Amino acid sequence: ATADPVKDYLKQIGKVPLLNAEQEVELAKRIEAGLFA
DNA sequence: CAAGGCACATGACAACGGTGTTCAGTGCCGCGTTGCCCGATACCCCCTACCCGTAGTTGACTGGCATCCGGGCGCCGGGTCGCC
């Protein structure tokens, strides 16, 4: 919580795992699995 | 000389004269009110032209922005970490 809220938003993005090909195709596979569920 | 007879006029008698008034009827000219006739005007319809909202567009493309000082000036007031 500081001034210039865009900076705090950027930190809120933080460090998250960027997705390579197989990672995201598996994610979409389980996405459609949950959709069918 | 007195009584009885005839003329003219006379107390009323209605009805004309002429003119003024009566109900009434109907108009005769003045003032105001009325049905027409149209004409325009609001108000339904149909047609399409155009404004405005929604939904797609697949090489890849993964963290920015320029701040800010030459007030100036002082106080309040609170926070804030050293201090022993």
From Swiss-Prot:
It comes from the Bacteria. Belongs to the sigma-70 factor family. Homotrimer (Potential). interacts transiently with the RNA polymerase core complex. Interacts with RNA polymerase-binding protein RbpA via its sigma-2 region (residues 211-347) in a free form. The chain holds residues 210 to 246 of 511 of the full protein. This is RNA polymerase principal sigma factor HrdB. The lineage of its organism: Bacteria, Bacillati, Actinomycetota, Actinomycetes, Kitasatosporales. Sigma factors are initiation factors that promote the attachment of RNA polymerase to specific initiation sites and are then released. This sigma factor is the primary sigma factor during exponential growth. Its activity is stimulated by RbpA. It comes from Streptomyces coelicolor (strain ATCC BAA-471 / A3(2) / M145).
